[PDB]
Amino acid sequence: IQMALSVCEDLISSQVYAILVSHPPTPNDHFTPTPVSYTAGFYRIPVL
Amino acid sequence: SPPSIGIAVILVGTSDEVAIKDAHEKDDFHHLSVVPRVELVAMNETDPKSI
Amino acid sequence: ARVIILSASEDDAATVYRAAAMLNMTGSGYVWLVGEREISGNALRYAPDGILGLQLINGKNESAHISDAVGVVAQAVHELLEKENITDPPRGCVGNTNIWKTGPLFKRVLMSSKYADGVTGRVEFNEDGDRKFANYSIMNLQNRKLVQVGIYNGTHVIPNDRKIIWPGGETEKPRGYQMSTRLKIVTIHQEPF
């Protein structure tokens, strides 16, 4: 939830052209592109 | 005593609010003792951060 | 039939490897096949001999991927600046919820371009938004240690040179199939027959 909130705050403060998302160093290799896939996706902006 | 009625109804279109609250408290379900504590909210142009 | 293609979690891979090793099944002529997750971690410990596996050539080099990504987004942006009738990116996630008009249009250019020279080979995107034409490092469990044998270029397979070991010794390649000569026939009562 904090990552989704910070993503909205960043795109509010940066109006990004394309956002890149990485993997977490805290195993659980499923929650990496959880927040950015649908948070910074409402405006249909490319995500890598 | 076991309420378990933490429910909430939220609208984001502000359509038929008066009829929504009018029928909200109209019938009793004592066979399912819940103490129906409910809530309400208005439209706020639902946005990711806003939501 | 002999060959057994597998795909599961590494934690479950260890358990299924132990279960297979419990019975006299892994060996002789039962050549296996696996992917990449169930060959690393703890799954390599309980794995038996004669395991042909899969492995990407470049899957952990973060810096090269970052460089290729920044290059491709830069070239796409440079290619799409010549367009017309564009809008600025939306300002604010707090009090704005709409759809960018120029959002989807970017798609039609970003996955339809060529990266040309790259440090991780050519960068091209299939019609799904996914990387294609990769290079896989074919691998074999030899003497309880991983060793590269054969590689993939994306289209055709390339066996390196060193000899793979099928399970339970027997360096000759198994047929991968058998024949059960114990078939059970069925009938039904009839007078003359």
mmCIF file of C-alpha atoms in Angstrom:
data_model
loop_
_atom_site.group_PDB
_atom_site.id
_atom_site.type_symbol
_atom_site.label_atom_id
_atom_site.label_comp_id
_atom_site.label_asym_id
_atom_site.label_seq_id
_atom_site.Cartn_x
_atom_site.Cartn_y
_atom_site.Cartn_z
ATOM 1 C CA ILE A 1 0.000 0.000 0.000
ATOM 2 C CA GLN A 2 2.891 2.347 0.785
ATOM 3 C CA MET A 3 4.454 1.579 -2.605
ATOM 4 C CA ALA A 4 1.172 2.343 -4.381
ATOM 5 C CA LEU A 5 0.848 5.600 -2.430
ATOM 6 C CA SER A 6 4.429 6.612 -3.234
ATOM 7 C CA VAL A 7 3.880 5.708 -6.899
ATOM 8 C CA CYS A 8 0.873 8.029 -7.058
ATOM 9 C CA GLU A 9 2.833 10.743 -5.238
ATOM 10 C CA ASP A 10 5.775 10.369 -7.635
ATOM 11 C CA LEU A 11 3.678 10.462 -10.808
ATOM 12 C CA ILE A 12 1.893 13.456 -9.278
ATOM 13 C CA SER A 13 5.263 15.145 -8.696
ATOM 14 C CA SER A 14 7.026 13.887 -11.850
ATOM 15 C CA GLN A 15 4.389 13.173 -14.576
ATOM 16 C CA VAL A 16 6.578 10.313 -15.735
ATOM 17 C CA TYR A 17 6.879 9.205 -19.366
ATOM 18 C CA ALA A 18 7.822 5.620 -18.418
ATOM 19 C CA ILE A 19 8.334 3.876 -15.061
ATOM 20 C CA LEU A 20 10.688 0.945 -14.480
ATOM 21 C CA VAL A 21 9.981 -1.591 -11.727
ATOM 22 C CA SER A 22 12.472 -3.974 -10.109
ATOM 23 C CA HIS A 23 12.437 -7.106 -7.912
ATOM 24 C CA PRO A 24 12.660 -6.963 -4.106
ATOM 25 C CA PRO A 25 15.667 -8.390 -2.244
ATOM 26 C CA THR A 26 13.236 -9.831 0.333
ATOM 27 C CA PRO A 27 12.307 -13.055 -1.534
ATOM 28 C CA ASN A 28 8.605 -13.553 -2.351
ATOM 29 C CA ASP A 29 9.139 -13.104 -6.077
ATOM 30 C CA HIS A 30 5.463 -12.404 -6.787
ATOM 31 C CA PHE A 31 4.795 -8.995 -5.162
ATOM 32 C CA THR A 32 7.337 -7.040 -7.187
ATOM 33 C CA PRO A 33 5.055 -5.651 -9.964
ATOM 34 C CA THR A 34 1.978 -5.527 -7.736
ATOM 35 C CA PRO A 35 1.716 -1.771 -6.996
ATOM 36 C CA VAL A 36 3.093 -0.212 -10.187
ATOM 37 C CA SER A 37 1.202 -2.494 -12.589
ATOM 38 C CA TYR A 38 -2.212 -1.111 -11.604
ATOM 39 C CA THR A 39 -1.362 2.116 -9.745
ATOM 40 C CA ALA A 40 0.691 3.748 -12.507
ATOM 41 C CA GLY A 41 -1.538 2.101 -15.096
ATOM 42 C CA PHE A 42 -4.733 4.115 -14.762
ATOM 43 C CA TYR A 43 -3.365 6.694 -17.218
ATOM 44 C CA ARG A 44 -2.110 3.980 -19.625
ATOM 45 C CA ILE A 45 1.579 4.850 -19.270
ATOM 46 C CA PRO A 46 4.296 2.364 -20.329
ATOM 47 C CA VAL A 47 5.848 0.292 -17.538
ATOM 48 C CA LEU A 48 9.060 -1.726 -17.906
ATOM 49 C CA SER B 1 -23.498 -9.123 21.541
ATOM 50 C CA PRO B 2 -21.598 -10.756 18.635
ATOM 51 C CA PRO B 3 -22.322 -7.920 16.185
ATOM 52 C CA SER B 4 -19.946 -8.746 13.299
ATOM 53 C CA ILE B 5 -21.653 -6.001 11.287
ATOM 54 C CA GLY B 6 -18.660 -3.933 10.229
ATOM 55 C CA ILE B 7 -20.246 -3.086 6.886
ATOM 56 C CA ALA B 8 -20.035 0.070 4.788
ATOM 57 C CA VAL B 9 -21.768 1.269 1.614
ATOM 58 C CA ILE B 10 -19.925 3.861 -0.488
ATOM 59 C CA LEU B 11 -21.221 5.534 -3.654
ATOM 60 C CA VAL B 12 -19.079 7.352 -6.214
ATOM 61 C CA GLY B 13 -21.887 8.498 -8.495
ATOM 62 C CA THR B 14 -24.236 10.220 -6.031
ATOM 63 C CA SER B 15 -27.211 8.506 -7.687
ATOM 64 C CA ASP B 16 -30.389 7.874 -5.660
ATOM 65 C CA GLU B 17 -28.826 8.598 -2.279
ATOM 66 C CA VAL B 18 -32.096 9.440 -0.503
ATOM 67 C CA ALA B 19 -33.733 6.207 -1.655
ATOM 68 C CA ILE B 20 -30.567 4.358 -0.616
ATOM 69 C CA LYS B 21 -30.715 5.595 2.981
ATOM 70 C CA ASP B 22 -34.520 5.322 3.139
ATOM 71 C CA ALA B 23 -34.533 1.571 2.475
ATOM 72 C CA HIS B 24 -31.274 1.079 4.403
ATOM 73 C CA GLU B 25 -33.187 0.983 7.709
ATOM 74 C CA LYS B 26 -36.539 -0.532 6.735
ATOM 75 C CA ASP B 27 -36.481 -4.252 7.665
ATOM 76 C CA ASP B 28 -35.418 -6.248 10.719
ATOM 77 C CA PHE B 29 -33.420 -9.495 10.620
ATOM 78 C CA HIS B 30 -33.510 -10.544 14.279
ATOM 79 C CA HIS B 31 -32.994 -14.166 13.205
ATOM 80 C CA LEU B 32 -29.506 -12.947 12.206
ATOM 81 C CA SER B 33 -28.549 -10.806 15.209
ATOM 82 C CA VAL B 34 -25.977 -8.415 13.747
ATOM 83 C CA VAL B 35 -26.588 -4.875 15.119
ATOM 84 C CA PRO B 36 -26.210 -3.429 11.600
ATOM 85 C CA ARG B 37 -23.774 -0.546 12.066
ATOM 86 C CA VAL B 38 -23.483 0.924 8.562
ATOM 87 C CA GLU B 39 -21.880 3.992 6.980
ATOM 88 C CA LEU B 40 -22.090 6.190 3.894
ATOM 89 C CA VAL B 41 -19.847 8.291 1.657
ATOM 90 C CA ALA B 42 -20.191 10.682 -1.276
ATOM 91 C CA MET B 43 -18.568 10.868 -4.692
ATOM 92 C CA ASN B 44 -14.999 12.175 -4.784
ATOM 93 C CA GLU B 45 -13.988 11.547 -8.425
ATOM 94 C CA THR B 46 -12.466 8.182 -7.545
ATOM 95 C CA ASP B 47 -8.730 8.233 -8.329
ATOM 96 C CA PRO B 48 -5.998 5.722 -7.370
ATOM 97 C CA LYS B 49 -4.457 7.874 -4.641
ATOM 98 C CA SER B 50 -7.877 9.261 -3.704
ATOM 99 C CA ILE B 51 -9.376 5.764 -3.520
ATOM 100 C CA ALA C 1 6.824 -44.345 -21.796
ATOM 101 C CA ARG C 2 9.889 -42.978 -20.026
ATOM 102 C CA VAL C 3 10.533 -39.227 -20.222
ATOM 103 C CA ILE C 4 9.089 -37.020 -17.464
ATOM 104 C CA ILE C 5 8.704 -33.281 -18.064
ATOM 105 C CA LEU C 6 8.367 -31.340 -14.808
ATOM 106 C CA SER C 7 7.482 -27.799 -13.741
ATOM 107 C CA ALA C 8 6.797 -26.856 -10.113
ATOM 108 C CA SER C 9 8.145 -24.873 -7.162
ATOM 109 C CA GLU C 10 11.672 -25.492 -5.895
ATOM 110 C CA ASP C 11 10.438 -26.278 -2.381
ATOM 111 C CA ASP C 12 7.972 -28.752 -3.889
ATOM 112 C CA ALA C 13 10.717 -29.813 -6.309
ATOM 113 C CA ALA C 14 12.839 -31.082 -3.418
ATOM 114 C CA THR C 15 9.930 -33.141 -2.071
ATOM 115 C CA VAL C 16 9.093 -34.638 -5.465
ATOM 116 C CA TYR C 17 12.779 -35.436 -6.051
ATOM 117 C CA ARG C 18 12.871 -37.248 -2.706
ATOM 118 C CA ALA C 19 9.675 -39.131 -3.573
ATOM 119 C CA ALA C 20 11.085 -40.162 -6.959
ATOM 120 C CA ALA C 21 14.346 -41.269 -5.331
ATOM 121 C CA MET C 22 12.374 -43.374 -2.837
ATOM 122 C CA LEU C 23 11.342 -45.727 -5.658
ATOM 123 C CA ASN C 24 13.731 -47.365 -8.110
ATOM 124 C CA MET C 25 12.554 -44.985 -10.839
ATOM 125 C CA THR C 26 15.282 -42.381 -11.426
ATOM 126 C CA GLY C 27 17.891 -44.215 -13.471
ATOM 127 C CA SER C 28 18.537 -46.809 -16.162
ATOM 128 C CA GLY C 29 16.517 -45.246 -18.975
ATOM 129 C CA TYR C 30 14.171 -42.681 -17.410
ATOM 130 C CA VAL C 31 15.613 -39.454 -18.800
ATOM 131 C CA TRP C 32 14.178 -36.400 -17.042
ATOM 132 C CA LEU C 33 13.625 -32.768 -18.088
ATOM 133 C CA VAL C 34 13.118 -29.607 -16.031
ATOM 134 C CA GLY C 35 13.074 -25.816 -16.288
ATOM 135 C CA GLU C 36 15.130 -23.311 -14.308
ATOM 136 C CA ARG C 37 13.543 -22.638 -10.901
ATOM 137 C CA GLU C 38 13.422 -26.303 -9.846
ATOM 138 C CA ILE C 39 17.133 -26.724 -10.674
ATOM 139 C CA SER C 40 18.495 -24.080 -8.256
ATOM 140 C CA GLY C 41 18.031 -23.173 -4.609
ATOM 141 C CA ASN C 42 17.537 -26.264 -2.477
ATOM 142 C CA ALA C 43 16.085 -28.183 -5.435
ATOM 143 C CA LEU C 44 19.584 -28.919 -6.746
ATOM 144 C CA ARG C 45 20.467 -30.722 -3.502
ATOM 145 C CA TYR C 46 17.776 -33.414 -3.697
ATOM 146 C CA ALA C 47 18.002 -33.736 -7.488
ATOM 147 C CA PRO C 48 19.398 -37.022 -8.856
ATOM 148 C CA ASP C 49 21.958 -37.596 -11.598
ATOM 149 C CA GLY C 50 21.005 -37.377 -15.261
ATOM 150 C CA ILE C 51 19.004 -34.148 -15.027
ATOM 151 C CA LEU C 52 18.969 -32.027 -18.170
ATOM 152 C CA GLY C 53 17.895 -28.500 -17.290
ATOM 153 C CA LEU C 54 17.412 -24.971 -18.576
ATOM 154 C CA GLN C 55 19.117 -21.673 -17.778
ATOM 155 C CA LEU C 56 19.049 -18.212 -19.343
ATOM 156 C CA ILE C 57 22.372 -16.778 -20.503
ATOM 157 C CA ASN C 58 21.691 -13.350 -18.942
ATOM 158 C CA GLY C 59 19.060 -13.286 -16.213
ATOM 159 C CA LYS C 60 20.825 -11.721 -13.232
ATOM 160 C CA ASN C 61 22.972 -8.937 -14.765
ATOM 161 C CA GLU C 62 20.937 -5.958 -13.591
ATOM 162 C CA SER C 63 23.260 -3.302 -15.040
ATOM 163 C CA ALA C 64 23.090 -4.569 -18.630
ATOM 164 C CA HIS C 65 19.293 -4.778 -18.480
ATOM 165 C CA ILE C 66 19.125 -1.238 -17.071
ATOM 166 C CA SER C 67 21.346 0.068 -19.872
ATOM 167 C CA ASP C 68 19.299 -1.679 -22.563
ATOM 168 C CA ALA C 69 16.034 -0.443 -21.046
ATOM 169 C CA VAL C 70 17.169 3.177 -20.861
ATOM 170 C CA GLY C 71 18.494 2.953 -24.417
ATOM 171 C CA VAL C 72 15.242 1.553 -25.790
ATOM 172 C CA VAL C 73 13.032 4.086 -24.004
ATOM 173 C CA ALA C 74 15.329 6.886 -25.189
ATOM 174 C CA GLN C 75 15.165 5.712 -28.807
ATOM 175 C CA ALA C 76 11.378 5.310 -28.630
ATOM 176 C CA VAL C 77 10.987 8.821 -27.194
ATOM 177 C CA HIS C 78 13.291 10.237 -29.874
ATOM 178 C CA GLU C 79 11.269 8.435 -32.547
ATOM 179 C CA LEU C 80 7.909 9.698 -31.251
ATOM 180 C CA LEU C 81 8.860 13.361 -30.742
ATOM 181 C CA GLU C 82 8.211 13.974 -34.459
ATOM 182 C CA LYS C 83 4.511 13.161 -33.988
ATOM 183 C CA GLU C 84 1.788 15.802 -33.690
ATOM 184 C CA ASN C 85 -1.376 16.401 -31.647
ATOM 185 C CA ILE C 86 0.129 15.275 -28.343
ATOM 186 C CA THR C 87 -0.749 15.981 -24.719
ATOM 187 C CA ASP C 88 1.393 16.427 -21.633
ATOM 188 C CA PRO C 89 1.452 13.681 -18.995
ATOM 189 C CA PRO C 90 -1.264 14.106 -16.362
ATOM 190 C CA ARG C 91 -0.438 16.048 -13.198
ATOM 191 C CA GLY C 92 -1.627 14.479 -9.958
ATOM 192 C CA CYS C 93 -2.866 11.165 -8.584
ATOM 193 C CA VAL C 94 -4.851 12.771 -5.750
ATOM 194 C CA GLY C 95 -7.594 14.724 -7.523
ATOM 195 C CA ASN C 96 -7.507 13.465 -11.106
ATOM 196 C CA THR C 97 -8.726 10.201 -12.646
ATOM 197 C CA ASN C 98 -8.807 10.147 -16.450
ATOM 198 C CA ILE C 99 -7.120 8.388 -19.377
ATOM 199 C CA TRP C 100 -4.136 9.854 -21.206
ATOM 200 C CA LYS C 101 -5.035 10.406 -24.857
ATOM 201 C CA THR C 102 -1.461 9.815 -26.061
ATOM 202 C CA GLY C 103 -0.921 6.821 -23.766
ATOM 203 C CA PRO C 104 -1.989 3.931 -26.005
ATOM 204 C CA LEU C 105 -0.529 5.635 -29.095
ATOM 205 C CA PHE C 106 2.947 5.303 -27.562
ATOM 206 C CA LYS C 107 2.373 1.538 -27.585
ATOM 207 C CA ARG C 108 2.123 1.421 -31.374
ATOM 208 C CA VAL C 109 5.692 2.762 -31.579
ATOM 209 C CA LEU C 110 7.493 1.395 -28.534
ATOM 210 C CA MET C 111 7.086 -2.311 -29.376
ATOM 211 C CA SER C 112 7.576 -1.751 -33.135
ATOM 212 C CA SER C 113 11.177 -0.526 -33.124
ATOM 213 C CA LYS C 114 14.659 -2.032 -33.361
ATOM 214 C CA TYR C 115 17.378 -1.475 -30.759
ATOM 215 C CA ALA C 116 20.135 -2.490 -33.239
ATOM 216 C CA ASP C 117 23.383 -2.971 -31.262
ATOM 217 C CA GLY C 118 22.954 -3.992 -27.636
ATOM 218 C CA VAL C 119 25.056 -5.490 -24.873
ATOM 219 C CA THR C 120 22.425 -8.222 -24.320
ATOM 220 C CA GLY C 121 21.978 -8.928 -28.022
ATOM 221 C CA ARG C 122 19.285 -7.445 -30.205
ATOM 222 C CA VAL C 123 16.234 -6.119 -28.358
ATOM 223 C CA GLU C 124 12.934 -6.933 -30.059
ATOM 224 C CA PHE C 125 9.434 -7.295 -28.640
ATOM 225 C CA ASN C 126 6.873 -9.890 -29.690
ATOM 226 C CA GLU C 127 3.227 -8.965 -30.184
ATOM 227 C CA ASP C 128 2.612 -9.315 -26.452
ATOM 228 C CA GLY C 129 5.144 -6.942 -24.915
ATOM 229 C CA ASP C 130 7.598 -9.731 -24.047
ATOM 230 C CA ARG C 131 11.230 -10.434 -24.903
ATOM 231 C CA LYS C 132 11.909 -12.995 -27.636
ATOM 232 C CA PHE C 133 15.018 -14.486 -29.272
ATOM 233 C CA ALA C 134 16.808 -15.342 -26.038
ATOM 234 C CA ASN C 135 19.828 -17.586 -25.444
ATOM 235 C CA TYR C 136 19.457 -20.553 -23.096
ATOM 236 C CA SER C 137 22.370 -22.375 -21.448
ATOM 237 C CA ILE C 138 21.577 -26.091 -21.502
ATOM 238 C CA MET C 139 22.826 -27.683 -18.295
ATOM 239 C CA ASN C 140 23.514 -31.151 -16.886
ATOM 240 C CA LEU C 141 23.973 -32.477 -13.351
ATOM 241 C CA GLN C 142 27.387 -34.169 -13.563
ATOM 242 C CA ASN C 143 28.980 -35.628 -10.417
ATOM 243 C CA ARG C 144 26.734 -33.551 -8.121
ATOM 244 C CA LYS C 145 27.955 -30.291 -9.704
ATOM 245 C CA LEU C 146 26.434 -28.157 -12.445
ATOM 246 C CA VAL C 147 28.232 -28.053 -15.798
ATOM 247 C CA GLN C 148 27.303 -26.374 -19.070
ATOM 248 C CA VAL C 149 26.681 -28.679 -22.039
ATOM 249 C CA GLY C 150 25.017 -27.242 -25.129
ATOM 250 C CA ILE C 151 23.425 -23.812 -25.579
ATOM 251 C CA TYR C 152 20.454 -22.242 -27.354
ATOM 252 C CA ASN C 153 20.514 -19.311 -29.774
ATOM 253 C CA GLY C 154 16.745 -18.769 -29.919
ATOM 254 C CA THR C 155 15.910 -20.818 -33.016
ATOM 255 C CA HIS C 156 18.128 -23.927 -33.262
ATOM 256 C CA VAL C 157 19.808 -26.007 -30.562
ATOM 257 C CA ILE C 158 23.607 -26.051 -30.287
ATOM 258 C CA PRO C 159 25.202 -28.996 -28.429
ATOM 259 C CA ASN C 160 28.578 -27.789 -27.168
ATOM 260 C CA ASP C 161 30.834 -30.878 -27.090
ATOM 261 C CA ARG C 162 31.045 -32.386 -23.603
ATOM 262 C CA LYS C 163 29.017 -35.553 -23.125
ATOM 263 C CA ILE C 164 25.817 -35.444 -21.072
ATOM 264 C CA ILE C 165 25.133 -38.252 -18.588
ATOM 265 C CA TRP C 166 21.730 -39.919 -18.597
ATOM 266 C CA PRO C 167 20.518 -41.095 -15.169
ATOM 267 C CA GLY C 168 22.224 -44.107 -13.630
ATOM 268 C CA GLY C 169 25.306 -44.038 -15.835
ATOM 269 C CA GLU C 170 24.765 -45.745 -19.195
ATOM 270 C CA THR C 171 26.151 -42.941 -21.346
ATOM 271 C CA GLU C 172 24.189 -44.314 -24.316
ATOM 272 C CA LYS C 173 21.029 -42.329 -24.995
ATOM 273 C CA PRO C 174 17.852 -44.144 -23.874
ATOM 274 C CA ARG C 175 15.041 -44.882 -26.296
ATOM 275 C CA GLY C 176 12.549 -43.121 -24.022
ATOM 276 C CA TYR C 177 9.829 -45.728 -24.574
ATOM 277 C CA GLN C 178 9.050 -49.392 -23.944
ATOM 278 C CA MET C 179 6.342 -51.935 -24.770
ATOM 279 C CA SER C 180 4.082 -53.764 -22.312
ATOM 280 C CA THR C 181 3.659 -57.340 -23.561
ATOM 281 C CA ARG C 182 1.035 -58.172 -20.922
ATOM 282 C CA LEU C 183 -2.147 -56.917 -22.567
ATOM 283 C CA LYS C 184 -5.461 -57.903 -20.970
ATOM 284 C CA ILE C 185 -8.107 -58.995 -23.486
ATOM 285 C CA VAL C 186 -11.879 -58.939 -22.903
ATOM 286 C CA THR C 187 -14.734 -61.124 -24.180
ATOM 287 C CA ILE C 188 -18.447 -61.813 -23.657
ATOM 288 C CA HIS C 189 -20.454 -65.042 -23.583
ATOM 289 C CA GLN C 190 -21.511 -66.459 -26.954
ATOM 290 C CA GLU C 191 -22.650 -69.914 -28.026
ATOM 291 C CA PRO C 192 -20.367 -71.081 -30.888
ATOM 292 C CA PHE C 193 -17.446 -68.695 -30.308
#
